[PDB]
Subunit: 185 residues, 4 copies
Amino acid sequence: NTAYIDTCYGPVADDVIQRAANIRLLICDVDGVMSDGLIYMGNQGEELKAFNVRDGYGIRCLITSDIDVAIITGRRAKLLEDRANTLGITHLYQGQSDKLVAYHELLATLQCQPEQVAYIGDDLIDWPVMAQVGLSVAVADAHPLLLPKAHYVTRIKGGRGAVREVCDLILLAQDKLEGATGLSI
Amino acid sequence: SNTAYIDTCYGPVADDVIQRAANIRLLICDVDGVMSDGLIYMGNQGEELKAFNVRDGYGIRCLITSDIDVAIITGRRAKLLEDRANTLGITHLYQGQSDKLVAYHELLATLQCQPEQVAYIGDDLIDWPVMAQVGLSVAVADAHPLLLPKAHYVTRIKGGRGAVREVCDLILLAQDKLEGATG
Amino acid sequence: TAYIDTCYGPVADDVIQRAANIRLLICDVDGVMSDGLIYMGNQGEELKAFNVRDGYGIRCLITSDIDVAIITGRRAKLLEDRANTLGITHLYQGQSDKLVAYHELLATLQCQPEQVAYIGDDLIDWPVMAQVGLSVAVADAHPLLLPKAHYVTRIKGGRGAVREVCDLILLAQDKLEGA
Amino acid sequence: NTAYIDTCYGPVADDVIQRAANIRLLICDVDGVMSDGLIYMGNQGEELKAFNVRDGYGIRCLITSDIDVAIITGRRAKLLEDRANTLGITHLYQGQSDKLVAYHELLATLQCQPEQVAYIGDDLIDWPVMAQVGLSVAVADAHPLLLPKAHYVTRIKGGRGAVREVCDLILLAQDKLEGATGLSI
Ligand SMILES: [Cl-]
Ligand SMILES: [Cl-]
Ligand SMILES: [Cl-]
């Protein structure tokens, strides 16, 4: 007889709400989480990535509500530094093959406990970190093997507002949703 | 209850909604998630792209040529949007607006429109302060879940896929101007 | 009504017969060869996305002695490039009244209206579609256009709706297997 | 009474599993397989193609598991050489009008039997090669006429992780899935 709470994305288990209430740091993977997993490449070496505006708003709400937001990704691109800058994200880790290193560095840097960390991932590479945190999240269309492992599976797909969904959940859990705002720096 | 509905090419529409659309003299659109899918394309050399829908363009032209004003209010700022606005003949463009109510009040004052004569299409919470005040508030099909139950009308078509066109068509139909409209 | 099975599902015998007479395929661009999106950038860049399977269908028609033309209201050099990569030599851009180009194609190619197929996605395409042998609306064309066409594709614009019509025409003309 | 094996993508026939167990070389077509079939063209002659990071991880898993990966396409673009370089793919054939020419070179140079080859296609142009291999694969949204011809039809659409799905199947079939390692690029 699990207890659930209605949210604007559907019912969420009380255990998940309780985990979300302790979050002081949200860590996000990029490709497949903030985007639908696509990398656009051109003939003169151009590269584009598509980000979702609604996720941006969620990220700003967290940051303005004293909840740190960090990024850990295996890829490396100037465009992501630009994106992080527009969102006010100062903790960006690119070109990371082993995500635990960046994760442990964040814990020490921010003097945060693992139970105070939420992590949104989409592939197996994310699991070693997700296995240790207070709130592990797999996006709706994450690799099938990651889905049953996470504390929460988002209703929204990667690149369509899965990050916003987790931002909304964390703020709801901490009774900060009604008053939160996400204006730019 | 027993609500009356009018059949439209997008499905049944409440009579209440048809009456609201019948009085529209100004359509205000948010951009990201309304005229687009909600995505921003960013590149390594600082390039930025946004994708607009051709079908929306046609609808906007039908409104403008039918003496129905169209305006854009957005918190973002990009030359690409000035370009898009120009191609559509939109002369009421407001970018970098953190408080959308400022631009909204200026438009009503300058265009001599009453709030009941204004329609607004949004996709997120920042659009609600303006939507709360207008005659026809519209949330796109895939708008943030919290906005959906608040709007007078929710489009069947998703943001960036013709949700703007759908509203343009609804307004024209409600005013007996759908047939004969050119865009 | 008699239906004939196709790799896209049953097609009415009436449509197969119409397809069998086609000598010219005319396509609109936005919403037909693409999903209706136009990408715009801050330095004035513009992109449009085309479907590779559609390209193959077009080449099959051209090599099977069936002409392929394009009539669009927009104008962009990117479209000239696409047309050229497909071997399309009949391209009409910046066309406000699509009937003008249509009547010109009939003359240039000494073609009859019943020998023309037209794939559209919006109301501006109807004046021409109303007059041809095989009018086609893409799966996700404007709702008002859908019930007016002789055939509605199962595949959406930009996802292979053009290839579908190409396959249908060739099937009807016993030219599919050898294409 | 066909026997099936449950995979993270759903049941897979025992016949397909046995075919996947013998694979030493995976050949991929590009457009509609590694991408959703779209070509982006610009007014200044720019050209872009979008690849999926989930597929990159699968390819790296194959290569690091001593399973070769090759690409054969009729198109030609510098962007594809760039994508192949990022994935460590060294067997790249572009502008190939007759795909069988490249296919025969690969088997000869790699000392690989047709039965040891898997090929992922999306259109009729791919059939001459698929007809000859041990594991022919059509992506979920491949041209309708190719679907009934392949040994296996992927659950995932072109450009959304159909390649990854095949990489996972081959590894599972060879008991190398759990130990597989790759990078989300
Ligand atoms: Cl944003
Ligand atoms: Cl337009
Ligand atoms: Cl092509």
